[PDB]
C-alpha cells in the first residue's frame, strides 16, 4: 500500500494547508504552523508500531473534525478554478498527418523536423520492444515503472507520447 | 524515498528529449509561408499615409473609419427600415399603433385649434 511513514507525511501537508485556510493571515499561520509542527515533534520516532497507529488514527479523526469545509485549492489542481481550463486547446500530433498539403506548405521547416522524429520513432521502436521483453519477469511486469535505455543511441522505451505530449498552454 | 538511480536516469533521458521537442515547436523567420495576398488600393494608400505618427491625421483617419461605419450600419439600414415602415407597414391597418398624446387642461390642438378651458381655480396653499 503506502507504508506508515508516508501517511503521516501526507497528513502533515494537509493539516498545514487546512490550517493555512483558517488563518489566512501569514503571521498567524507561521505562529500556528510551528505549533502544529511541535505536536508532530513530540511523538517523532517513539517506535511501538502498535501505539504509532493509535496516534495516527486519532490524528486523522482530529483532522477530519477540524478540516476546513472549503479549503484553498491551487487554481490548476483538482478542484481549482482553472483545472483543465486548457484541455480544449490540446490537440494531439497525429492530426497533423491529416493536414492538407496546401497548408503544410505554410510550415516547410516544421514538417521537415517532424519527418526526423517520425523517422527516429520508427527506427527505435524495434529496440524498445526488445528493451522491454528482456527487462521484464516471465509473468509480465509487476510495476508501472519503465527502464531507461541501457546503451548509447537507444531512446527510453515508450517515450513517444511522453515526450510529444501537448504543451500546457498550447494557445 | 528519493529517486532510484534508474528512475532519475530515465527522467534525464526523457527530459533532454522533451526540451529538444519543445525547441522544434518554433517558427522559422519565414513561417508561416503566406500566399501572395494582394492588397487593395485603399489598404496600401493608408499604410503610406499612416507611416508618420502625425496625431493630427489620426483623428481624421478615425473619422473616416466611423464615417464609413455610420454609413453602412446606421444610414443604409435606416433608409431600408424607413422605406419599409413608411410604404409597406403603415399601409396596413393597426400595424403601427401609437398611444394618443396626453392633453392637459389649457392646451391648443394643432388639428382643429381647440383651446380647452385652463382649469378651475385652486384653493391656494403653501409649504
Amino acid at each position: 500500500y503506502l507504508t506508515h511513514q508516508q501517511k503521516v507525511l501526507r497528513l502533515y501537508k494537509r493539516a498545514l494547508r487546512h490550517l493555512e485556510s483558517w488563518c489566512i493571515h501569514r503571521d498567524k499561520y507561521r505562529y500556528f504552523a510551528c505549533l502544529l509542527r511541535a505536536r508532530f515533534d513530540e511523538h517523532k520516532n517513539e517506535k511501538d508500531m502498535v501505539k504509532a497507529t493509535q496516534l495516527l488514527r486519532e490524528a486523522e479523526e482530529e483532522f477530519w473534525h477540524g478540516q476546513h469545509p472549503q479549503p484553498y485549492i491551487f487554481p490548476e489542481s483538482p478542484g481549482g478554478t482553472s483545472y483543465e481550463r486548457y484541455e480544449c486547446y490540446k490537440v494531439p500530433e497525429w492530426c497533423l498527418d491529416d493536414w492538407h498539403p496546401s497548408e503544410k506548405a505554410m510550415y516547410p521547416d516544421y514538417f521537415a523536423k517532424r519527418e526526423q522524429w517520425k523517422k527516429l520513432r520508427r527506427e527505435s521502436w524495434e529496440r524498445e520492444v526488445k528493451q522491454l521483453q528482456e527487462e521484464t519477469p516471465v509473468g509480465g511486469p509487476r510495476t508501472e515503472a519503465l527502464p531507461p535505455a541501457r546503451k548509447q543511441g537507444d531512446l527510453p522505451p515508450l517515450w513517444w507520447h511522453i515526450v510529444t505530449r501537448p504543451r500546457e498552454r498550447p494557445m | 524515498s528519493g529517486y532510484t538511480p534508474e528512475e532519475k536516469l530515465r527522467l534525464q533521458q526523457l527530459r533532454e528529449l522533451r526540451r529538444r521537442w519543445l525547441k522544434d515547436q518554433e517558427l522559422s523567420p519565414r513561417e508561416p509561408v503566406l500566399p501572395p495576398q494582394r492588397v487593395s488600393p485603399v489598404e496600401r494608400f493608408w499604410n503610406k499615409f499612416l507611416q508618420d505618427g502625425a496625431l493630427w491625421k489620426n483623428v481624421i483617419y478615425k473619422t473616416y473609419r466611423h464615417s464609413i461605419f455610420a454609413f453602412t450600419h446606421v444610414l443604409i439600414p435606416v433608409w431600408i427600415i424607413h422605406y419599409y415602415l413608411k410604404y409597406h407597414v403603415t399601409t396596413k391597418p393597426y400595424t403601427i399603433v401609437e398611444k394618443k398624446p396626453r392633453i392637459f387642461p389649457g392646451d391648443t390642438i394643432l388639428e382643429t385649434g381647440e383651446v380647452i378651458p385652463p382649469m378651475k381655480e385652486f384653493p391656494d396653499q403653501h409649504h
Binding site: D98, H100, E103, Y110, P166, M171 | E26
Partner: peptide
Amino acid sequence: KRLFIIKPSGFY
C-alpha cells in the same frame, strides 16, 4: 518567440 499551434486540419 512564436511556437507552432497544433490544430486539426482546417482545410476540409
